[PDB]
Design a protein around this ligand. Structure first.
Ligand SMILES: *[C@@H]1O[C@H](CO)[C@@H](O[C@@H]2O[C@H](CO)[C@@H](O[C@@H]3O[C@H](CO[C@H]4O[C@H](CO)[C@@H](O)[C@H](O)[C@@H]4O[C@@H]4O[C@H](CO)[C@@H](O)[C@H](O)[C@H]4NC(C)=O)[C@@H](O)[C@H](O[C@H]4O[C@H](CO)[C@@H](O)[C@H](O)[C@@H]4O)[C@@H]3O)[C@H](O)[C@H]2NC(C)=O)[C@H](O)[C@H]1NC(C)=O
Ligand SMILES: *[C@@H]1O[C@H](CO)[C@@H](O[C@@H]2O[C@H](CO)[C@@H](O[C@@H]3O[C@H](CO[C@H]4O[C@H](CO)[C@@H](O)[C@H](O)[C@@H]4O)[C@@H](O)[C@H](O[C@H]4O[C@H](CO)[C@@H](O)[C@H](O)[C@@H]4O)[C@@H]3O)[C@H](O)[C@H]2NC(C)=O)[C@H](O)[C@H]1NC(C)=O
Lengths: 213, 213
């Protein structure tokens, strides 16, 4: 064939925070040197739009260019299920490649957030684990972060945490876990930690759950 | 080209338990009706073997057969890093397709297992969540299960649990979480639950961590 197209959704956090701005990204790979001509046509539910923006092309070590087309979207357009289509055309293609992406369908469901202290057996070590359980949400688009009331003297570098991907639960909903690693002295001195979750189905798209000794 | 080949590693649990038998699986898709002839040649570190077994072909909705070749492997052969090669040949191919798979390289690291009781705020609900943290292991091949001392009268159907995929941690090791959902009355009556973890770097490839009220 010829070039390949891939269309990605906006960041879950971008569509949920008022401060941020979501965008859809249409990437084009496998584009030839002989015909590096690429065009884009964007359609929101079958209605063309021309506010998208194409970034400069870039060569890769595999001797192929890379074209990307970014389309900023309204917060509530995506959350209401509007479908976004990217139409790519180039000489190397017999017919243009059209791709579409939208939010997962299904009545959203609200997550429950639970913080669990570190296991008693983990204090033998110096780094202990604070856990945040987020369960029962749909769709799986979600954002998770940790906060502290600890000054930089205890945390000169920021907080160290990692979050699992969403896992389909036995009731059609999703769950995940996020682990925050902190020194034991910080846990013992009464530091207040906070698990923050952004999800469509939450009121104000946000909830925050605390954890401390 | 023609048909496509895919080679899969043995289940982590299969290579760790003596009772089970691990297998490398070499799948062939996109095989034509005009030429449904397939051959396999297996090599363990460049040494041919003839104990593999081919299962009957199966028709697909897209009108393509699918041929599978299964090779049982010795437990310690895989765990010691031996590379397994699958060579596929068919009329529709100009030259045979060879694929190889082996265990991830790197000094193995032993996991730590910690059980966390359900959050106090989750008792509002009837289904509560028991958590098992497994962290600090390498490679990411691991198997996790839950056990109970509860008869079938409390659990006529088995235990309900889901386990996350491994997540790369900030020290090059991996962690995961497994969630067991149980009715609150079972938690309150003293039922003893058990998180069982099978990993190469564990002594006897097995460890078990308990949890109860
Ligand atoms: C006619 O219909 C067929 C069936 O629908 C089509 O077959 C499919 O063909 C595609 C390629 O076009 C293959 O894609 C690959 O999938 C691999 C994963 O396969 C496992 O998981 C899927 C479900 O997720 C499952 O259906 C497979 O059968 C396979 O299951 C595994 O099976 C083994 C033993 O059989 C078992 O031990 C495992 O536990 C089990 N695992 C699971 C999760 O069930 C990928 O690994 C491949 O990835 C490659 O390519 C990626 C990018 O393309 C790259 O990132 C990767 O690194 C890697 O290189 C690849 O995506 C499907 O597997 C195959 N499905 C089946 C059932 O055969 C057929 O293509 C279609 N005809 C045509 C013309 O399209
Ligand atoms: C020249 O070199 C560049 C970089 O090495 C290659 O760019 C990649 O090309 C492959 C072509 O297959 C693309 O593969 C697709 O990747 C997607 C992942 O997107 C994430 O990752 C990229 C980079 O890591 C991020 O930029 C992006 O924001 C995302 O975070 C997958 O989603 C795709 O999977 C889907 O399609 C395949 C094929 O149908 C299915 O098998 C999957 O199941 C799934 O449906 C796919 O794997 C890759 O995206 C390209 N990266 C970038 C950054 O563009 C060029 O391909 C290479 N040139 C040639 C000719 O290959």
């Amino acid at each position: 064939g010829g070039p390949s197209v891939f269309l990605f959704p906006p960041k879950p956090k971008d569509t949920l925070m008022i401060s941020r701005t979501p965008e859809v990204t249409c990437v084009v790979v496998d584009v030839s040197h002989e015909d590096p001509e690429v065009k884009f046509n964007w359609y929101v539910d079958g209605v063309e739009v021309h506010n998208a923006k194409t970034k400069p092309r870039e060569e890769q070590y595999n001797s192929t260019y890379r074209v990307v087309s970014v389309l900023t979207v309204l917060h509530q357009d995506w959350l209401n299920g509007k479908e976004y289509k990217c139409k790519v055309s180039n000489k190397a293609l017999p017919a243009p490649i059209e791709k579409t992406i939208s939010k997962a369908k299904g009545q959203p469901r609200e997550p429950q957030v639970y913080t669990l202290p570190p296991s008693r057996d983990e204090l033998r070590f110096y780094q202990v684990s604070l856990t945040c359980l987020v369960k029962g949400f749909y769709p799986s688009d979600i954002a998770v972060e940790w906060e502290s009331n600890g000054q930089p003297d205890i945390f000169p570098n920021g907080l160290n945490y990692k979050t699992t991907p969403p896992v389909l639960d036995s009731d059609g909903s999703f769950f995940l876990y996020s682990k925050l690693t902190v020194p034991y002295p910080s846990w013992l001195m009464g530091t207040r930690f906070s698990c923050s979750v952004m999800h469509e189905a939450l009121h104000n798209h946000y909830t925050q759950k605390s954890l401390s000794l």
